[PDB]
Design a protein around this ligand. Structure first.
Ligand code: ARA
Length: 305
């Protein structure tokens, strides 16, 4: 019957895999087929929409590889009589202002960022680190709003908790992955020999993991590193290791909700001109660590070690 697209920027992330999985579920529930496409860059994005059209899809959910493609995506879709819903990453105009008109479903970025900071500080306190010889490494992707609001949130929280502002070092990453974050963290590490203990701030699991990997390379032991990721699902391989690392835990969101709900809303729209709410913010979050990850996953229905 009805065909709907589910386009994601990073198909390799468990986050996005989970959104795909739950979109499938909505498909089975509501009676539509989900066409799952990877759109890692702008070219593939625009091409992919062309393909959808050839397939006779009525609309698509998208997590764009670039928010600035917003205009183009919308123009293309319009042309094809396709309805669009954005997941995770909000469309912006040329000027960098949000395209409010496109329905969006995303995490409560600021709130989750702030929770990251809170939990970083809590764990620091637990370990009894001397603030004097501690520092925050904030690996940023400021060109992406969602990423920005997380890392700002985190930094704000740390500062509010009384972590010295002067000891917070930001470094931009060129890619939102391990390799990117690794590179960034490495360059910051060598700049600060004075630091004995690091808090690692990053918008997601991969970013923080990259940070952790770099610290290990610069001869830091797990005890001296705290990195708390965001996503949860992305962190499972890390949390499953025999030995504890600098990667302490992750804030598990609801990619299940994002996948299912975005899909379901698109369907209602396409099938019944049921106009989605412009903004859907998902506030779920739980801290998963080495101790509780398996419970919490299975509790949330994302089972399997
Ligand atoms: O890239 C991130 C992804 O890892 C998840 O955190 C959702 O938001 C996207 O911007």
């Amino acid at each position: 019957n009805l065909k709907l697209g589910f386009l994601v920027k990073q198909p390799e992330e468990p986050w996005f895999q989970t959104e795909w999985k739950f979109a499938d579920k909505a498909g089975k529930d509501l009676g539509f087929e989900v066409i799952k496409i990877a759109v890692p860059d702008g070219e593939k994005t625009l091409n992919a929409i062309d393909s959808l059209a050839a397939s006779g899809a009525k609309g698509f959910v998208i997590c764009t590889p670039d928010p600035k493609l917003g205009s183009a995506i919308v123009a293309k879709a319009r042309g094809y009589d396709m309805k669009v819903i954005a997941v995770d990453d909000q469309f912006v105009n040329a000027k960098g202002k949000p395209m409010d008109t496109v329905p969006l479903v995303m995490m409560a970025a600021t709130k989750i960022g702030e929770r990251q900071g809170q939990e970083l500080y809590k764990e620091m306190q637990k370990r009894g680190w001397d603030v004097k010889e501690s520092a925050v490494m904030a690996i940023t992707a400021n060109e992406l709003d969602t990423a920005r609001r997380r890392t700002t949130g985190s930094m704000d929280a740390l500062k509010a908790a009384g972590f010295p502002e002067k000891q917070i070092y930001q470094v931009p990453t060129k890619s939102n992955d391990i390799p990117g974050a690794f590179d960034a963290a490495n360059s910051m590490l060598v700049q600060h020999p004075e630091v004995k203990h690091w808090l690692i701030v990053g918008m997601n699991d991969s970013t923080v993991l990259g940070g952790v990997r770099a610290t290990e390379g610069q001869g830091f032991k797990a005890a001296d590193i705290i990195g708390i990721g965001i996503n949860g699902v992305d962190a499972v391989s890390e949390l499953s290791k025999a030995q504890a690392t600098g990667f302490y835990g992750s804030l598990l969101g609801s990619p299940d909700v994002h996948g299912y709900k975005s899909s379901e809303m698109l369907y209602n729209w396409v099938a019944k001109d049921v106009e989605p709410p412009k903004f859907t913010e998902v506030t779920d979050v739980v801290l998963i660590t080495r101790d509780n990850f398996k419970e919490e996953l299975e509790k949330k229905g994302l089972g399997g070690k």
